[PDB]
């Protein structure tokens, strides 16, 4: 039985998101990529240099926004500037959200020597796709 990126079936009460509700064989069929760049092309290079920075940011944002991050990040890479789209719950005050976004846009940009954009979308709760 395949277990990679596959959440098993419970008694029928667990809420699952649109991403976890799809097996790994649905990538580019029904669900899209969480990261977009040029390193994964045919005649292009720098596949690992972007992958390590992707994983580092996956961990950094998870540690920066604990408990309030709903789903995974959307990491776009477009013309020397990288965009980070996040779906955050509205648990923290707006002042604490702005403090953290201003800290991130100034820390990650200087840490990776490239401009970073951080876009936040506040959801009231985790959007449930399948049974809940």
| DSSP code, position 38 | S
The structure tokens 């009231």 sit at 124
Whole-angstrom Cα distance, residue 110 to residue 76? 18
Among 4, 9, 28, 48, binds other proteins (CB under 8 A): 28
Binding to RNA (CB under 7 A) within 9-28 occurs at: 9, 12, 23-25
Decide whether 25 or 110 has the Cβ nearer to RNA. Answer: 25
Kindly tell me which residue out of 3, 29, 95, 113 binds other proteins, with binding defined by CB under 8 A. 29
Question: How many whole angstroms separate alpha carbon 115 and alpha carbon 132?
Answer: 40
Cα angle value 24/83/99 (rounded, 5°):
115
Residue 3 in the binding site for RNA (CB under 7 A): yes
Report what 23 binds from other proteins, RNA, none; CB cut-off 5-8 Å by kind: RNA
Which residues lie across from 27 on neighbouring strands? 31
Query: What, of other proteins, RNA, none, does residue 32 touch, CB below 5 to 8 Å by kind?
Result: other proteins
Q: Which residues here bind other proteins, judged by CB under 8 A?
A: 28-32
């Amino acid at each position: 039985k395949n277990r990679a990126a596959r959440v098993r079936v419970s008694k029928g009460d667990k809420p699952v998101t649109y991403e976890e509700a799809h097996a790994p064989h649905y990538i580019a069929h029904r669900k899209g990529w969480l990261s977009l760049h040029t390193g994964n092309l045919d005649g292009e290079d720098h596949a690992a240099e972007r992958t390590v920075e992707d994983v580092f940011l996956r961990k950094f944002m998870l540690g920066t926004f604990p408990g309030c991050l709903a789903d995974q990040l959307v990491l776009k890479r477009r013309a020397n500037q990288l965009e980070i789209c996040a779906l955050v719950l509205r648990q923290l005050p707006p002042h604490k959200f702005y403090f953290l976004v201003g800290y991130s846009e100034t820390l990650l940009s200087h840490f990776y020597k490239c401009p970073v954009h951080l876009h936040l979308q506040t959801v009231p709760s985790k959007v449930v796709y399948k049974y809940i």
